[PDB]
């Protein structure tokens, strides 16, 4: 099969570059973070604006949802993370500890924990209820690009400009695995597959890679896009055909066939680098976001 994504809506509102877009686990909403220091919520199916959330002192590089679609966590250059009640827009907690910009964040599946990654080279695990830092991992020797929990929260995967992807035991804080291929390009993003068996990693040499975690081996490689300067989000699209989706520094969204590694579609519309892509939990919908010269989020749909 091949996808046939088409633009349906363009969401406008941010006054500066958009950094991350994420659909609610319930499928109803889309949250967006930006260098304008705000988070905005939008309807996932119509792109209708819903609300704006504020409080950060500096720009936000990432946002993440709780499993019940009720809470959101944000990561900022103000060196803090914030948890928010989406229904009210109120900040429930401000997590402090990082000594430099917080770049990435995610809740575990139970959503009692939040994992964070910073330019301070650390990965931290926090208690959502109290805001306390439960553990600080000396994870890398360079800025941490991404952090993600597996399906049961037993593991955390991390990536860095140091060229490494590492897997950690949530409970112990021990490093269970370090993955690296032949070359050591900086790693700009990482995430577990939805079944937790595989890991998708992006490197700043215009390459995406699929890894079997258990075997510690690279199974697939995806190329064609441009990615050498920015930490762009990538995803597994599993609602229809099995695709790998990513942003690109050529202003396009790329979609590849997971098995053949062929590019099946390139989505044109943005006027600047596509920094983030998100795939809808149940429908064949992709959300895409772009940098300063564009400032828009776009919603695409396929059969």
């Amino acid at each position: 099969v091949k996808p046939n994504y088409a633009l349906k809506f363009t969401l406008a509102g941010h006054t500066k570059a958009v950094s991350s877009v994420k659909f609610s686990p319930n499928g109803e909403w889309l949250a967006s973070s930006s260098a304008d220091k705000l988070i905005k919520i939008w309807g996932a199916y119509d792109g209708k604006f819903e609300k704006t959330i504020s409080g950060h002192k500096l720009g936000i590089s990432d946002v993440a949802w709780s499993s019940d679609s009720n809470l959101l966590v944000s990561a900022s250059d103000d060196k803090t993370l914030k948890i928010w009640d989406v229904s009210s827009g109120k900040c429930l907690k401000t997590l402090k500890g990082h000594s430099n910009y917080v770049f990435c964040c995610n809740f575990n599946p139970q959503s009692n924990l939040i994992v964070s990654g910073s330019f301070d080279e650390s990965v931290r695990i926090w208690d959502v209820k109290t805001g306390k830092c439960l553990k600080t991992l000396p994870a890398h020797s360079d800025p941490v690009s991404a952090v993600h929990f597996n399906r049961d929260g037993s593991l955390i995967v991390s990536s860095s400009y140091d060229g490494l992807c590492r897997i950690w035991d949530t409970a112990s804080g021990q490093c269970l695995k370090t993955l690296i291929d032949d070359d050591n390009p900086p790693v700009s993003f990482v995430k577990f597959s939805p079944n937790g068996k595989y890991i998708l990693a992006a490197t700043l040499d215009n390459t995406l890679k699929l890894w079997d975690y258990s075997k510690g081996k690279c199974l697939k490689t995806y190329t064609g896009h441009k990615n050498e300067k920015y930490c762009i989000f990538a995803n597994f699209s599993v609602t229809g055909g099995k695709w790998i989706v990513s942003g690109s520094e050529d202003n396009l969204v790329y979609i590849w066939n997971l098995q053949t590694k062929e590019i099946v579609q390139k989505l044109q519309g943005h006027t600047d680098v596509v920094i983030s892509t998100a795939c809808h939990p149940t429908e064949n919908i992709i959300a895409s976001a772009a940098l300063e010269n564009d400032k828009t989020i776009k919603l695409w749909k396929s059969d």
Partner: peptide, 7 residues
Amino acid sequence: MRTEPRP
């Protein structure tokens, strides 16, 4: 900021 490029 993720919106700013790597030097």
